Design a protein around this nucleic acid. Structure first.
Lengths: 142, 64, 140, 115
RNA sequence: GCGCUACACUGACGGAGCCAGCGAGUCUAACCUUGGCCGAGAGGUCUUGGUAAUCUUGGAAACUCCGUCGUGCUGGGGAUAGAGCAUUGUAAUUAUUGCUCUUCAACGAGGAAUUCCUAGUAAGCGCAAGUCAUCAGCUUGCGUUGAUUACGUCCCUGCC
């Protein structure tokens, strides 16, 4: 006895990333390699890959950490400022799309759920699937 | 990158005590892009024993 | 993972569109010593292509030179989404197309000289050598 | 030799056409100009373009119109028309075309001198 | 004249940790938009809530992470360019902005000058408002990291 919290903020990231890389169920939406996530990034994600399976443990640990939120919330979070260039540097809110679609794909198995008030809440499974996998990422630290 | 750049490298980088990637562009000169590779490779009991952190500096070192 | 033993088919300068390239530079560029292409049509013609994004410009199978001269030039076929674009609607010949290397230099050209036939003010303010976007420039 | 096919789309229908038709085929701005503050632009030019193109002998250019609608569009029924525009004082005329078609009116009239 | 980025390994690129505060906001109509999809992306949209400690909105950047780059004007510099693709706008031309990829301009710590500053103070990393259909390299306001140096004179200027 054994927590999601008791364990670090990028081992759980890369060791649910190689869980949700090697699950196959996960689905993988059609503007999820090309398209730039965020519009101030020039560079999309340098993975081009299963950022989608590194945004599938972020999102997900991020929920549960709090109550509820999303898509115009994971909209203020994932971006940062702007590269305006010359114009004194400026926040920019992503693209609700990819995680408006992992948030309807996580909806699928029984990990993330829709919190009544509504919008993403992790289910009751789900959590079961994050306390199984915060204790399998605690023993790559142990 | 040809084959007296990696075996100049490995016979020179076991007891070679202080290293990095500014260490292989000033001693073996061309590259850097590659270098953080044929250092790190392995980590066979006879390359580098480190007190290296993150990304941002990789400060490596001596098997013994 | 190691120093890769590059034989010489490491070949040490390259030539893509007649328009120079250097041959032990980390690719996506090198495709950027060019006109009309720059690390965004370049990180598509490599993802729609069977590529390395970490290989150099010399280290190029040729089946990866002629498929990477080829997506380029075509545009709609290996999913090129058409917002992705510069020749966005011809408006003379539609069309969904790419203005290239030698060709962004003679089309920069042929877009000024459908509005200098006119006598208007998007290619007459390019004409006085002074700028069209609406500002007061004096400083510069 | 190869004629200006306006977007060959195959002059032929870009000679003499509707107002639905090219309402669509302009570049983004204009969508938001035929459809925005649409009425009261040609309350009486397309009705003095049609009095002009129309009171001539054709081929002798027609008798000059008036206008201060430098805010009208260039459409495939005003092809030839003659047109004459307020830069703030006097009526500068203009040859009206198939390759002016989609472009701004009185850009053309040059107002301000330069040097 | 007022200003932005930079001459680096005390940094540039990247995963992986991953953190506030000042606001604002739609009504007689289109202000904020998530969510869940479509787009490499820029975005598109279905649909959603919200006249707001009630929604977008608890996830901003400097950073710790884990490293590749190795003294190569580079893997500092991001100038100027070629096209396309988008997102507004009756009008995008003297490309409003954005993306997609390549062209890879100076400058290798800034002379005679000359400013502002005694404590959360100097300064840098952001952002919300003021424009506004948009276009910030400005105006205002905030915090998150945060020290040197005095804490005194009339040499000067300036004015009493």
């Amino acid at each position: 006895g054994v927590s999601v919290r008791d364990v670090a903020a990028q081992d759980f990231i890369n060791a649910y990333a190689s869980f949700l890389q090697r699950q196959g169920k996960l689905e993988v939406p059609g503007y999820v390699d090309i398209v730039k996530t965020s519009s101030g990034n020039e560079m999309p994600p340098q993975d081009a890959e299963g950022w989608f399976y590194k945004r599938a443990a972020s999102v997900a640990r991020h929920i549960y950490m709090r109550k509820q939120v999303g898509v115009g919330k994971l909209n203020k979070l994932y971006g940062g400022a702007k590269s305006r260039g010359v114009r004194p540097y400026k926040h920019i809110d992503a693209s609700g799309s990819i995680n408006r679609k992992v948030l309807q794909a996580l909806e699928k198995i029984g990990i993330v759920e829709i919190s009544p008030k509504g919008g993403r809440r992790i289910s009751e499974n789900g959590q079961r699937d994050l306390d199984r996998i915060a204790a399998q990422t605690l023993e790559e630290d142990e | 990158l040809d084959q007296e750049k990696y075996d100049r490298i490995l016979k020179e980088v076991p007891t070679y005590r202080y290293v990095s990637v500014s260490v292989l562009v000033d001693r073996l000169k061309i590259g850097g892009s590659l270098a953080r590779i044929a250092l790190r490779h392995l980590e066979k009991e006879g390359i580098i024993k480190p007190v290296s952190k993150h990304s941002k500096q990789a400060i490596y070192t001596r098997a013994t | 993972s190691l120093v890769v033993q590059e034989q010489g088919s490491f070949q040490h300068i390259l030539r893509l569109l007649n328009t120079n390239v250097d041959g032990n530079i980390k690719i996506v560029y090198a495709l950027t010593t060019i006109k009309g292409v720059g690390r965004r049509y370049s990180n598509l013609v490599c993802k729609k292509a069977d590529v390395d994004l970490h290989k150099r410009a010399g280290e190029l199978t040729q089946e990866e030179l002629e498929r990477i001269v080829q997506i380029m030039q075509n545009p709609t076929h290996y999913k090129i989404p058409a917002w992705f674009l510069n020749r966005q609607n011809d408006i003379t010949d539609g069309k969904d197309y790419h203005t290239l290397a030698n060709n962004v230099e003679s089309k920069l050209r042929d877009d000024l000289e459908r509005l200098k036939k006119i006598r208007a003010h998007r290619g007459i303010r390019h004409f006085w050598g002074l700028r069209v976007r609406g500002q007061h420039t004096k400083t510069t | 030799f190869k004629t200006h096919s306006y977007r060959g789309v195959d002059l032929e229908k870009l000679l003499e056409m509707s107002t639905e038709d090219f309402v669509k085929l302009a570049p983004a701005r204009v969508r938001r100009r035929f459809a925005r503050g649409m009425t009261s632009k040609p309350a009486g030019f397309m009705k003095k373009l049609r009095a002009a193109k129309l009171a001539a002998p054709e081929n002798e250019k027609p008798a000059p119109v008036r206008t201060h609608m430098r805010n009208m569009i260039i459409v495939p029924e005003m092809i030839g028309s003659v047109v004459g525009i307020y830069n703030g004082k006097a009526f500068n005329q203009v040859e009206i075309r198939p390759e002016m078609l989609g472009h701004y009116l009185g850009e053309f009239s040059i107002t301000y001198t330069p040097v």
